[PDB]
Amino acid sequence: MQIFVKTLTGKTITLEVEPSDTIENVKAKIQDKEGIPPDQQRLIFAGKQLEDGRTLSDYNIQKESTLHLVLRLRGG
């Protein structure tokens, strides 16, 4: 199936995934297209940040859902 990612500057990209794809798999697919390493990416869907070790199916993410890609401003 296809899902979408709203990236950093205005664009959307299209990923080919299965419900069983891990969040790591999804981040790798984003890196394949965007050159942003998985360890910098955060993906938000339905108010939840998607976590490594879980799958798209764990979040009930269906076809044509959009993940929101956001980086970090670390502060202390």
Place this chain on the structure above:
Amino acid sequence: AQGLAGLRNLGNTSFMNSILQCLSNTRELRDYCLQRLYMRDLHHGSNAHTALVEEFAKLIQTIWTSSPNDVVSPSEFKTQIQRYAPRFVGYNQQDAQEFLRFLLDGLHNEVNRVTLENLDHLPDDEKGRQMWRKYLEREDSRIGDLFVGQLKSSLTCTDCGYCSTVFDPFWDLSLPIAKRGYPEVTLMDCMRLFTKEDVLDGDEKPTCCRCRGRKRCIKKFSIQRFPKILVLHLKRFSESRIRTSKLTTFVNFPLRDLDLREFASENTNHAVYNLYAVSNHSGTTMGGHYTAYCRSPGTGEWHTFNDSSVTPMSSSQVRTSDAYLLFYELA
């Protein structure tokens, strides 16, 4: 009962303090804590995270019973949030929006009122309403009452003309920043970047299942349901394939009368908002410091909350390029 207590930095915890103060000044969330209304929503049984809601609420209670110049420790709260979200264990610098999302999800899960189909025949709005009902059958809490809205994503095949719609819940919106404005980038410009027509072609062609092949499609967001509290997160990070840098662009956001008519779904009633809190970041992507500017729900006066220091400020000092999260409430 003025709510002007500072929060001790426990070791790189300004990100947490900034968020906590924004939440402290979220009127209805504060009131839920002060009126102890969470007690009846807590789940029965030995649960690992009931103490998260209890310690959050106790912190808010403490802030709103404090005297001038008081500084209180959120250490017991930190112990609980890091048990829910172990990425917050220890004393490293963190992103405030990441923290916000995990904290609100943890709170929501603990007071969730829930304890345990092809719709092509329906008009769009009715499909939206049914998908909303389905969402609320899983996620129904006081926390969601405040923060949750619904996006419509409309995906139109440029060949066959079929528009496939999906409805995604949201608890905040993360907005791309426009590259410049005339003479300045506005919050509305960023909202437009979020909600514009996105052309999906070349490498990004979706598969149209009507055409049974990859086709150029147009994707567009609109807001199907507006939240009571609208949290806007500015994407202050470059897309460099080598090294991200912080985008420090001034984004002009309004104090009052943020009118989102143009982003509402077609023939859907729209919302107008007023600002009540800002989380500010100063630094780089790798490190820095957070503060909050918050409007007191009772007095309407703005204060800067910077760890242990709480100081009055003019509304003219609220809009700055340091703004990272904007907290809006219905007008």
